[PDB]
Amino acid sequence: KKKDDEIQDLKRKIEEMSAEFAKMLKDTLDKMQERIEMVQWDSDTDPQMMKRLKDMTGLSNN
Amino acid sequence: KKKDDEIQDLKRKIEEMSAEFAKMLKDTLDKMQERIEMVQWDSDTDPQMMKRLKDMTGLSNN
């Protein structure tokens, strides 16, 4: 029973670590995209450049 | 013995996942820095803005 409890605790810790990893990487991607968009808008670059970057990133709604 | 072996396997998986998550964070940060540097260098922003951004990011080497 004690080994079973330890295994269950380890699996729960694994699930928590996976959840935290997912949330942290989601936050990192959000921050990166927000910074990219802010640096894109602050300058007066031609919209072609931002369209090209959006095409290269492959984030088109599907 | 089998429960101990499964505990060992769970610990091995946990450590491997931690290592891969840390390496993925490092790769994401490196790519973000590379892209930000490229965007800053392509434009003619005053070095003051880059210095201010570096100060804000809190990445001063010790």
Side-chain angles (χ1 to χ4, degrees):
Chain A
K1 71 88 181 177
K2 68 93 174 180
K3 301 208 195 283
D4 287 334
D5 303 345
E6 181 183 359
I7 288 169
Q8 286 306 319
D9 287 346
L10 297 171
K11 179 203 56 203
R12 294 181 67 189
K13 276 182 180 175
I14 288 173
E15 315 297 356
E16 279 182 357
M17 60 82 68
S18 287
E20 186 179 2
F21 154 77
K23 205 162 189 175
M24 276 191 281
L25 274 195
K26 187 177 177 183
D27 285 350
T28 310
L29 291 173
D30 302 346
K31 282 180 187 173
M32 294 182 286
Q33 199 152 7
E34 286 175 3
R35 184 169 294 165
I36 294 168
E37 273 187 4
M38 212 75 188
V39 183
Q40 215 169 21
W41 182 228
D42 71 355
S43 172
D44 278 335
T45 311
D46 205 5
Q48 293 179 356
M49 294 299 291
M50 45 199 178
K51 211 169 184 173
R52 279 177 187 165
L53 294 175
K54 189 174 180 174
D55 269 351
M56 71 155 298
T57 197
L59 288 166
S60 69
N61 269 353
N62 272 346
Chain B
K1 183 68 176 177
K2 66 94 175 179
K3 301 192 295 301
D4 183 76
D5 289 340
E6 189 172 356
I7 294 163
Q8 307 305 322
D9 188 2
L10 279 171
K11 286 295 291 182
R12 195 144 317 147
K13 291 194 284 288
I14 299 169
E15 278 177 358
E16 290 182 4
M17 291 183 292
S18 289
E20 57 170 320
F21 153 65
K23 296 309 151 271
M24 294 182 286
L25 293 176
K26 267 68 174 173
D27 300 349
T28 305
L29 292 173
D30 295 349
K31 187 33 191 163
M32 182 179 72
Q33 192 153 7
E34 298 166 6
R35 183 161 290 162
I36 294 171
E37 274 177 3
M38 183 278 288
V39 177
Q40 293 178 353
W41 276 80
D42 63 45
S43 173
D44 266 331
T45 303
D46 208 8
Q48 267 183 15
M49 295 298 102
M50 278 66 59
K51 200 179 179 176
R52 277 183 186 169
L53 195 149
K54 188 177 180 173
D55 269 350
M56 170 78 100
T57 189
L59 297 169
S60 73
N61 267 352
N62 291 319

